[PDB]
């Protein structure tokens, strides 16, 4: 049906259909079933590149590109701009580069297009297929083609110019696409704050043309792995019933979908939320979870950010200026009784009364025998406080003061 649709269209469906399922189900980390349960539909229905997921490099490393017309969405310089800056993402990281060409025929010609426009993939009204791009060669190889159907825009909504124009010309310049969801080259539309290269974008570009010869060699952020034994974590807390943990610009959390874990962007659920979080704690009576970075916090509820956040902690929690940053959060639900924890020390906040308990920077290790004197991340579940620094995760009766477990950080996952 609409499986059916999906691998035609990027699977190469010519039961061949359960062995194009399980395939697909392979590359978008799904439980290998061949069979269509409701999150590979959710999949299937995400707005994507043309090019199929299943099946060289230009000859020159000075390269031509033209736009041989331009979206109304957007100012003409926007388009410009967003291409420009496109290109020079992979310029960045190889010797690879672009002059812009205002008329002739270049290398890499950019188009806007409705439907059918020539070329035997013809795009689909707004949504779905956004954009596709031609393998390196002679005629239209190179070629990237924007569905105008689309909303194309030059900040965070969808579908940002600049973040598909990236992924386009990188099938331009001879890349697939790849099942690290972090990677601009990811099947699926994704945003999360600046468009930049993940390390396996570099990693595949390099591989094809070289490192640059800029002393610095760039990097770009890896995906977590939920598997990985040296995970580590940002922040982690409870959000109405189930817990999510952050690293970088990712979550994690449990789901049945997922043989080990769902991974996603942030940006996914709260895209003003900045990259890099410290702590995060839910306030469950207001129906409320808090994000921190810095000296600021933004609060939110569900999917929906509330107004006038990011707001600073000294004013909201009556933090000394000296507190830089907070390390780990976790508000206590039949309490109001809010830990937040700074270095070797802790505070507690009530949030009913809405000020610091008196007597509070107290000493983590005189209160938290046996967790070390930092903390990654923290959340409560079942009375217990998990607390995790590093690679360890302990399990932490408040009532006896006792280390029940200590585990791997990444043992809450299907590993
Ligand atoms: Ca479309
Ligand atoms: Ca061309
Ligand atoms: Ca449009
Ligand atoms: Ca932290
Ligand atoms: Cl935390
Ligand atoms: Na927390
Ligand atoms: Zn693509
Ligand atoms: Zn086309």
């Given at each position: 049906?609409?499986?059916?649709?999906?691998?035609?269209?990027?699977?190469?469906?010519?039961?061949?259909?359960?062995?194009?399922?399980?395939?697909?189900?392979?590359?978008?980390?799904?439980?290998?079933?061949?069979?269509?349960?409701?999150?590979?539909?959710?999949?299937?229905?995400?707005?994507?590149?043309?090019?199929?997921?299943?099946?060289?490099?230009?000859?020159?490393?000075?390269?031509?590109?033209?736009?041989?017309?331009?979206?109304?969405?957007?100012?003409?310089?926007?388009?410009?701009?967003?291409?420009?800056?496109?290109?020079?993402?992979?310029?960045?990281?190889?010797?690879?580069?672009?002059?812009?060409?205002?008329?002739?025929?270049?290398?890499?010609?950019?188009?806007?297009?409705?439907?059918?426009?020539?070329?035997?993939?013809?795009?689909?009204?707004?949504?779905?297929?956004?954009?596709?791009?031609?393998?390196?060669?002679?005629?239209?190889?190179?070629?990237?083609?924007?569905?105008?159907?689309?909303?194309?825009?030059?900040?965070?909504?969808?579908?940002?110019?600049?973040?598909?124009?990236?992924?386009?010309?990188?099938?331009?310049?001879?890349?697939?696409?790849?099942?690290?969801?972090?990677?601009?080259?990811?099947?699926?539309?994704?945003?999360?704050?600046?468009?930049?290269?993940?390390?396996?974008?570099?990693?595949?570009?390099?591989?094809?043309?070289?490192?640059?010869?800029?002393?610095?060699?760039?990097?770009?952020?890896?995906?977590?792995?939920?598997?990985?034994?040296?995970?580590?974590?940002?922040?982690?807390?409870?959000?109405?019933?189930?817990?999510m943990f952050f690293?970088?610009?990712f979550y994690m959390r449990?789901?049945?979908?997922?043989?080990?874990?769902?991974?996603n962007?942030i940006?996914?659920?709260?895209?003003?939320?900045?990259?890099?979080?410290?702590?995060?704690?839910?306030?469950?009576?207001?129906?409320?979870?808090?994000?921190?970075?810095?000296?600021?916090?933004?609060?939110?509820?569900?999917?929906?950010?509330?107004?006038?956040?990011?707001?600073?902690?000294?004013?909201?929690?009556?933090?000394?200026?000296?507190?830089?940053?907070?390390?780990?959060?976790?508000?206590?639900?039949?309490?109001?009784?809010?830990?937040?924890?700074?270095?070797?020390?802790?505070?507690?906040?009530?949030?009913?009364?809405?000020?610091?308990?008196?007597?509070?920077?107290?000493?983590?290790?005189?209160?938290?025998?046996?967790?070390?004197?930092?903390?990654?991340?923290?959340?409560?579940?079942?009375?217990?406080?998990?607390?995790?620094?590093?690679?360890?995760?302990?399990?932490?009766?408040?009532?006896?003061?006792?280390?029940?477990?200590?585990?791997?950080?990444?043992?809450?996952?299907?590993?």
């Amino acid at each position: 049906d609409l499986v059916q649709k999906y691998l035609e269209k990027y699977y190469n469906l010519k039961g061949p259909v359960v062995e194009k399922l399980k395939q697909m189900q392979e590359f978008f980390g799904l439980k290998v079933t061949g069979k269509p349960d409701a999150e590979t539909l959710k999949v299937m229905k995400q707005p994507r590149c043309g090019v199929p997921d299943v099946a060289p490099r230009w000859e020159q490393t000075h390269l031509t590109y033209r736009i041989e017309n331009y979206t109304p969405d957007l100012p003409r310089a926007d388009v410009d701009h967003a291409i420009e800056k496109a290109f020079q993402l992979w310029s960045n990281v190889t010797p690879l580069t672009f002059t812009k060409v205002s008329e002739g025929q270049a290398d890499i010609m950019i188009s806007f297009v409705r439907g059918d426009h020539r070329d035997n993939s013809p795009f689909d009204g707004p949504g779905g297929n956004l954009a596709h791009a031609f393998q390196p060669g002679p005629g239209i190889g190179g070629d990237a083609h924007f569905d105008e159907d689309e909303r194309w825009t030059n900040n965070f909504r969808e579908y940002n110019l600049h973040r598909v124009a990236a992924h386009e010309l990188g099938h331009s310049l001879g890349l697939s696409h790849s099942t690290d969801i972090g990677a601009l080259m990811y099947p699926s539309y994704t945003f999360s704050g600046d468009v930049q290269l993940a390390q396996d974008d570099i990693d595949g570009i390099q591989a094809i043309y070289g490192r640059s010869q800029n002393p610095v060699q760039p990097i770009g952020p890896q995906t977590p792995k939920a598997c990985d034994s040296k995970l580590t974590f940002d922040a982690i807390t409870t959000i109405r019933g189930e817990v999510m943990f952050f690293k970088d610009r990712f979550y994690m959390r449990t789901n049945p979908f997922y043989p080990e874990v769902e991974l996603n962007f942030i940006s996914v659920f709260w895209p003003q939320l900045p990259n890099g979080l410290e702590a995060a704690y839910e306030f469950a009576d207001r129906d409320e979870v808090r994000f921190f970075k810095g000296n600021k916090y933004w609060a939110v509820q569900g999917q929906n950010v509330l107004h006038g956040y990011p707001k600073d902690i000294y004013s909201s929690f009556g933090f000394p200026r000296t507190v830089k940053h907070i390390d780990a959060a976790l508000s206590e639900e039949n309490t109001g009784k809010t830990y937040f924890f700074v270095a070797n020390k802790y505070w507690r906040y009530d949030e009913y009364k809405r000020s610091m308990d008196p007597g509070y920077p107290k000493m983590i290790a005189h209160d938290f025998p046996g967790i070390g004197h930092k903390v990654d991340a923290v959340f409560m579940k079942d009375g217990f406080f998990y607390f995790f620094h590093g690679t360890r995760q302990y399990k932490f009766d408040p009532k006896t003061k006792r280390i029940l477990t200590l585990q791997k950080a990444n043992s809450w996952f299907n590993c």
